């Protein structure tokens, strides 16, 4: 399976002086890093979310960070002050950035940027554009950021160079975890419309009639549910999965 | 990329109004003032990002700042003092980093 | 004072070469740039330094930058008279409008004729 890189990032401006920014990255459905406001530095949540990059590297690349959110939390704040009062707090800046591998040596970066809840501004080729649907006022801090040359570069690296070389290695180190393979246990219940309770199960994709969404444990495993709606005497329910192995539920 | 500055130099009364105007004819949104002292680089005062906009700088108390238009960014001293006198640069700037500076006005301010 | 420069004074006979320092702190550091302030007038730019290890030359002024010491140096060469002025260093913390410049006090030099 072709697995997804991704680096969220949640920003909130309350008003002119007051700001946080909470990160967390997750490679597929698992989560390789956390970076909180409080915290100085990118912290690790498994043994391999290094990747196969060197202390050194890594050093390199948590710096860039470090400056960088350093960095947006002030402009942001100036470009609120280009904008008002066409602007006005809270504000709420989210980003997801990262690559998705495909077969061979292939990948596809992204840097998706969302103001107040709706997806507005990503980076594309060498410059930040508005995506259809942003609201017209966004062309000023646009044309801002895209004055800024030395940004461009530095993003043009690390989505279409450093991204997919680190998710590469990080594929390596994380093939342990990542092919890991967990069962299923699955309990009967019925409301005033049965239900089918599939639990524990790793990787995604399950063969649990209605069905419902995929819900998180917290040790990394999947919850799901499938309901059916006086005529209990001829039903059973049934799941198939990869961690079985020709042997269903 | 022309900015300059009115007036030039000014002589005024602890207590008394101060009006130092600049204007630009780039159509820059961007504008800035500063004052410049010995034994310190220019420090930012106040500055505009276009008409309607003023923004509190490093050094913002004892100045108001108003912006009427595009072209013009007046630093305000409603009661002067003798602290105030000093050196005024204004400066202007489009989306880029540079900023393009006048001239500067020397205020000084007596009892 | 993120930007210190050095020497704070200088007097060079008409003819010699001078170089003037400049060290800061600044973070980021997307450029750093030097003014020469005549006595009474105001700010003309000699030189900007955007890479980092940059060399600029613009006449008998020269310049280096290294952001990794965050470190610059103007070279006069073959000074003149008019020369006698006020050299200032100021780094700017982004590549856009978005940035604040940081401005050292200067170095006076006065040539002797």
């Known amino acids: 399976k072709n697995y997804t890189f991704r680096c969220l990032q949640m920003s909130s401006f309350a008003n002119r002086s007051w700001s946080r920014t909470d990160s967390v990255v997750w490679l597929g459905d698992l989560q390789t890093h956390r970076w909180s406001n409080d915290s100085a530095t990118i912290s690790f949540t498994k043994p391999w979310s290094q990747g196969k990059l060197s202390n050194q590297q890594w050093e390199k690349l948590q710096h860039m960070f470090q400056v960088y959110r350093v960095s947006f939390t002030r402009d942001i704040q100036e470009l609120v002050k280009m904008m008002s009062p066409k602007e006005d707090y809270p504000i709420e800046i989210q980003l997801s950035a990262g690559c998705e591998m495909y077969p061979g040596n292939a990948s596809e970066s992204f840097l998706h940027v969302a103001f107040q809840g709706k997806y507005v501004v990503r980076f594309w080729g060498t410059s930040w554009q508005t995506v259809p649907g942003a609201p017209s006022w966004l062309d000023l801090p646009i044309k801002v950021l895209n004055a800024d040359q030395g940004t461009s570069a530095t993003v043009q690296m690390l989505l279409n160079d450093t991204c997919p070389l680190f998710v590469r290695g990080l594929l390596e180190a994380g093939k342990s975890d990542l092919e890991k393979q967990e069962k299923p246990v699955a309990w009967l219940s019925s409301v005033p419309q049965l239900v089918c309770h599939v639990s524990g199960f790793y990787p995604k994709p399950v063969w649990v009639t209605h069905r419902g969404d995929f819900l998180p444990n917290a040790d990394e495993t999947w919850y799901l549910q499938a309901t059916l709606d006086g005529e209990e005497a001829g039903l059973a329910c049934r799941v198939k999965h990869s961690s079985l192995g020709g042997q269903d539920i | 990329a022309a900015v300059t500055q009115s007036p030039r130099n000014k002589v005024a009364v602890t207590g008394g109004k101060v009006t130092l105007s600049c204007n630009q004819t780039?159509?820059?949104?961007?504008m800035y003032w500063y004052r410049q002292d010995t034994g310190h680089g220019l420090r930012l005062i106040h500055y505009?990002?276009?008409?309607?906009?003023?923004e509190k700088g490093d050094i913002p108390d004892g100045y108001k700042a108003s912006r009427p238009s595009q072209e013009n960014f007046s630093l305000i001293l409603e009661l002067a003092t003798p602290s105030q006198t000093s050196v005024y640069f204004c400066?202007?700037?489009?989306?880029?980093?540079?900023?393009?500076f006048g001239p500067g006005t020397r205020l000084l301010v007596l009892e | 004072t993120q930007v210190e420069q050095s020497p704070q004074s200088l007097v060079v006979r008409q003819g010699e070469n001078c170089v003037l320092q400049?060290?800061?702190?600044?973070?980021?550091?997307?450029?750093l740039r030097w003014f020469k302030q005549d006595t009474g007038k105001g700010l003309v730019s000699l030189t900007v330094?955007?890479?980092?290890?940059d060399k600029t030359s613009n006449g008998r002024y020269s310049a280096t930058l290294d952001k990794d010491a965050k470190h610059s140096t103007l070279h006069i060469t073959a000074t003149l008279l008019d020369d006698t002025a006020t050299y200032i260093c100021?780094?700017?913390?982004?590549?856009?409008?978005?940035?604040?410049?940081?401005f050292g006090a200067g170095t006076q030099l006065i040539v002797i004729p």
């Open positions: 400066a202007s700037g489009d989306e880029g980093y540079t900023q393009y």
């Open positions: 780039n159509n820059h949104n961007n």
């Open positions: 505009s990002y276009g008409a309607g906009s003023t």
């Open positions: 400049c060290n800061y702190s600044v973070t980021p550091d997307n450029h």
């Open positions: 330094l955007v890479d980092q290890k």
């Open positions: 100021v780094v700017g913390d982004r590549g856009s409008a978005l940035g604040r410049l940081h």
